[PDB]
Amino acid sequence: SIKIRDFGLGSDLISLTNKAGVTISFTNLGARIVDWQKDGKHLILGFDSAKEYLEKDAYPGATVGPTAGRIKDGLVKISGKDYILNQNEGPQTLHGGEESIHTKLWTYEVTDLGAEVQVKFSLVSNDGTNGYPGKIEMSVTHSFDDDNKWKIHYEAISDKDTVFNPTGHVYFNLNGDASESVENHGLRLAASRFVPLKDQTEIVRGDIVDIKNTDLDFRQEKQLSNAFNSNMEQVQLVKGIDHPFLLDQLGLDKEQARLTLDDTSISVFTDQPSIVIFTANFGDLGTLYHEKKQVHHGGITFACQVSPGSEQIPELGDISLKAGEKYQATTIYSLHTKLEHHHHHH
Amino acid sequence: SIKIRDFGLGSDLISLTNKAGVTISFTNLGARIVDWQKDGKHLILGFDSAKEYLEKDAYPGATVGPTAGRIKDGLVKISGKDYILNQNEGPQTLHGGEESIHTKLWTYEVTDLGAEVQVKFSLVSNDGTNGYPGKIEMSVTHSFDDDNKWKIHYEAISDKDTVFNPTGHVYFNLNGDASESVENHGLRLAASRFVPLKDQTEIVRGDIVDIKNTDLDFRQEKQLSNAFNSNMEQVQLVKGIDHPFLLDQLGLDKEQARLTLDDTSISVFTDQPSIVIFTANFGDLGTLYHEKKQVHHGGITFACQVSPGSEQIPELGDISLKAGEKYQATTIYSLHTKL
Numbered sequence: 001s002i003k004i005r006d007f008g009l010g011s012d013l014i015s016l017t018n019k020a021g022v023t024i025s026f027t028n029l030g031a032r033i034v035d036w037q038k039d040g041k042h043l044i045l046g047f048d049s050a051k052e053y054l055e056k057d058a059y060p061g062a063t064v065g066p067t068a069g070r071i072k073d074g075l076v077k078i079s080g081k082d083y084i085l086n087q088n089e090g091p092q093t094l095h096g097g098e099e100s101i102h103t104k105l106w107t108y109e110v111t112d113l114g115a116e117v118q119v120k121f122s123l124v125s126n127d128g129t130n131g132y133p134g135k136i137e138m139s140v141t142h143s144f145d146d147d148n149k150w151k152i153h154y155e156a157i158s159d160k161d162t163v164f165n166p167t168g169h170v171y172f173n174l175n176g177d178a179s180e181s182v183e184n185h186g187l188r189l190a191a192s193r194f195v196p197l198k199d200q201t202e203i204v205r206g207d208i209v210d211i212k213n214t215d216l217d218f219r220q221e222k223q224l225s226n227a228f229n230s231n232m233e234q235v236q237l238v239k240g241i242d243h244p245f246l247l248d249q250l251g252l253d254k255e256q257a258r259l260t261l262d263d264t265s266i267s268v269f270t271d272q273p274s275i276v277i278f279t280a281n282f283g284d285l286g287t288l289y290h291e292k293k294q295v296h297h298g299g300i301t302f303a304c305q306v307s308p309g310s311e312q313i314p315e316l317g318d319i320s321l322k323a324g325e326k327y328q329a330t331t332i333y334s335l336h337t338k339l340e341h342h343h344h345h346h
Numbered sequence: 347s348i349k350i351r352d353f354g355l356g357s358d359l360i361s362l363t364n365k366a367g368v369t370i371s372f373t374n375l376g377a378r379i380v381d382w383q384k385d386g387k388h389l390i391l392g393f394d395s396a397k398e399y400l401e402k403d404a405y406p407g408a409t410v411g412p413t414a415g416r417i418k419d420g421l422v423k424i425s426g427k428d429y430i431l432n433q434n435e436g437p438q439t440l441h442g443g444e445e446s447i448h449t450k451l452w453t454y455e456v457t458d459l460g461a462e463v464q465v466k467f468s469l470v471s472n473d474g475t476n477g478y479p480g481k482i483e484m485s486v487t488h489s490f491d492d493d494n495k496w497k498i499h500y501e502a503i504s505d506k507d508t509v510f511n512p513t514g515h516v517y518f519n520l521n522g523d524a525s526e527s528v529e530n531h532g533l534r535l536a537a538s539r540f541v542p543l544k545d546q547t548e549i550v551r552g553d554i555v556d557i558k559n560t561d562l563d564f565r566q567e568k569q570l571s572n573a574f575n576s577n578m579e580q581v582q583l584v585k586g587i588d589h590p591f592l593l594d595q596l597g598l599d600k601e602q603a604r605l606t607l608d609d610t611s612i613s614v615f616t617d618q619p620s621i622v623i624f625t626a627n628f629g630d631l632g633t634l635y636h637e638k639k640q641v642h643h644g645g646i647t648f649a650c651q652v653s654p655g656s657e658q659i660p661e662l663g664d665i666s667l668k669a670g671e672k673y674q675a676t677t678i679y680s681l682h683t684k685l
C-alpha cells in the first residue's frame with residue numbers, strides 16, 4: 001500500500017508497506033528517508049515532522065550533495081579551471097554548501113510496480129548555485145520491494161563540466177532508541193584501508209592507511225564498542241568514527257557491510273568505492289528524536305560515495321562530471337532477520 | 347474556509363473561501379495564484395494541476411524573479427562590476443533565467459486571521475544561482491480577506507549586494523474563458539508615459555515616451571479594442587501591448603488601474619512605480635485552459651514592479667539590493683461587484 005499526507009511546511013510524507021508488513025517512509029524535503037520500521041521498531045533515526053529537520057538537524061536521512069563531505073577550502077579544479085564553492089564550514093565546503101539540496105522541496109512521482117514501489121524525486125541545481133557549474137538535472141529514486149530491499153538510485157546530467165558525488169545520509173540505530181548507543185551492534189565491513197583526517201577541521205590528512213589488525217579492522221565481525229573504546233589517535237581525534245573506508249572489492253554484487261543486532265541485520269550493497277562512517281559523535285548535544293535525547297554514538301551512517309579528499313588524494317577517484325555525461329550511482333540496504341547468531345551483552 | 351490538497355508532483359493547492367463566498371487558490375509551486383472565482387466563474391487564467399504549468403506555460407500566476415522582465419544581454423552592473431546572468435531568451439535574461447523561482451516548490455505556512463487568511467511562501471536562492479549574488483532569503487505572502495482584497499507582500503534579504511525586482515504574473519480575463527478576447531474589457535490606468543521597445547527582441551528602446559492623447563492613454567476609462575486596433579507602431583510591433591507604463595503618482599493608497607467587464611471590476615494598488623501590461627499576444631499558440639483554447643489577447647497582466655530597462659535608462663529607477671538591506675513590496679488586487 002502507498003499512502004501520502006502533508007508532513008509540514010508544504011512537504012509530503014510518502015509511506016510504503018510491503019507484502020511482509022515492513023513499512024518505510026520518505027519526504028520530498030531533501031529526497032530523504034524519514035523512517036523504517038519492523039514490528040513497531042525504528043531501524044533508523046528520524047523526526048516526526050519537517051520543521052524538526054529544519055530546526056534540529058537537516059542531514060539525517062537526506063540526500064546530500066552535489067558533493068558529499070568536505071572540500072578543503074571549497075576549492076575544486078574543473079577542466080583546468082579553479083572554482084571556489086560556497087564555504088559553509090570555516091573555509092571548507094561541507095555537503096555542497098549552505099542551504100543545499102537537503103533543504104529543498106523536490107518534486108516527485110510515485111510508480112507502483114507491484115512487488116516494488118518507486119519514489120522518484122527531482123530537482124534542478126541551477127548553473128552557479130553555491131559556485132557549482134550547471135545546470136544540473138538531478139533525480140533520486142527511492143524504492144522498496146517485497147524482499148525488504150531499500151534501493152537508492154541517483155541520476156544526473158549537467159549542461160557544463162562540473163563535479164558530482166552525492167550520498168544518502170541515513171543513520172541506523174537498531175536499538176530503535178536514539179538514547180541507546182550503537183556500541184552493542186555488530187559490524188562487518190570489507191575494507192582494509194582508511195583515510196585519516198588531518199585534525200579537528202576534518203579535512204583529509206593526505207595519506208591512506210592500512211587498518212588491518214587494529215581496532216578499526218571490521219573484516220571479521222566485531223562489536224562497535226571495540227572501536228569506541230579505542231585510543232588510536234584517529235579515534236580520539238573525532239571521539240568515535242568519522243572516516244572514509246576504502247572498499248577492498250568493488251561491485252554492486254558484494255555485501256560490503258553488515259550491521260547486526262540480535263536477530264536483525266542490515267546489509268549494505270553499492271557501486272561506489274567507499275563508505276563514509278560517522279557515529280554521531282555529538283557528545284552531550286542530545287538532539288531529541290521522538291522525545292528521546294540522542295546519546296553520543298546513538299547512530300551510524302554508511303554513506304556510500306567516492307571518498308572525500310580526492311582533491312588532495314587523487315588516488316581516491318575523480319568526481320568530475322562532463323557536460324552531457326550521465327551520472328549514475330546505486331546503493332542498497334537490505335534487511336534480514338536471523339542472518340546470523342548475535343547474542344551479546346554490554 | 348481553507349482547503350489543502352495535493353496539486354500533483356508533490357505540490358499543494360491552498361484554497362481560501364471568504365465570508366462572501368469568493369474562492370481564491372494558490373500553489374507552492376512558484377508561490378502562485380491558480381484560480382480566482384465568483385459565482386463559479388473564473389476571473390483569471392490558470393490550470394488544473396501542477397503538471398500543466400510545467401508542461402504548458404510556467405509563468406501564469408507566478409512569482410517571477412529575482413528580476414522580472416528582460417535584461418539586455420543578461421548584463422547587470424553590481425558595485426561597479428559587470429555580472430552576466432543566465433540567458434534564456436537569446437542573449438537576454440527573461441524572468442530570472444532558466445528554471446527560475448517560478449519553477450521551484452516553496453515551503454509555506456498558513457495563518458488564519460479570521461477575516462483574513464495569509465499564506466506565507468519562502469525560498470532561498472543560493473549565492474551564485476543563475477548568476478545572481480546571494481544568498482537571498484525571499485518570502486511572498488499572499489493574502490485574501492472578507493473584503494475581496496487579494497494582497498501580495500514581498501520581503502527579501504541578501505548576504506551580498508545584488509539585484510531584486512520580482513513581480514506577480516497573474517493574467518486576468520473577466521470573460522472567465524481563455525477562448526474569449528479581453529478586447530471587450532474597459533481599462534483605466536493612471537499613467538501618462540510609457541517605455542517603448544526597441545524591436546522584436548523586446549529590449550527597451552532607450553527612451554521614455556509621453557502617451558497623453560494617444561491610443562494608449564487610459565487615464566480615462568476606455569475599451570481595449572481601441573488600443574488593439576491602433577496603428578501606433580509600438581502596438582503594431584507586438585500585436586497588442588507588452589510594455590511598462592509609468593505611474594503618475596506613487597503610493598499604495600491610490601487606485602492605479604482598473605479593469606472592468608459589465609458588473610465586475612478589478613482595482614490595482616501598488617507601491618511600485620510601474621505596471622507592465624502584456625495582453626497575451628500569442629497569436630495562434632492556443633494554449634489550453636480548462637480545455638478552452640487560448641486566443642491571442644485572451645488575457646492581460648498587471649505586473650507591478652520597477653520598469654524593466656533601468657540598465658539602459660537609469661531614470662527608471664534602481665533595482666539594486668545592498669547586503670543586509672530588507673527589500674519590501676506590496677501589490678493589491680481588489681474585487682468589486684456593482685449593484
Ligand SMILES: OC[C@H]1O[C@H](O)[C@H](O)[C@@H](O)[C@H]1O
Nearest residue numbers: 059069202242243277278301
Ligand atoms: O552532521 C553532518 C556529519 O556529516 C558527515 O557525517 C560528516 O563527516 C560528519 O563529520 C558530520 O559533519
Ligand SMILES: OC[C@H]1O[C@H](O)[C@H](O)[C@@H](O)[C@H]1O
Nearest residue numbers: 405440548588589622624647
Ligand atoms: O509569458 C511571458 C511573458 O512575460 C512578460 O509579460 C513579457 O513582457 C511578455 O513578452 C512575455 O515574455
Ligand code: NI
Nearest residue numbers: 006012357358
Ligand atoms: Ni502535499
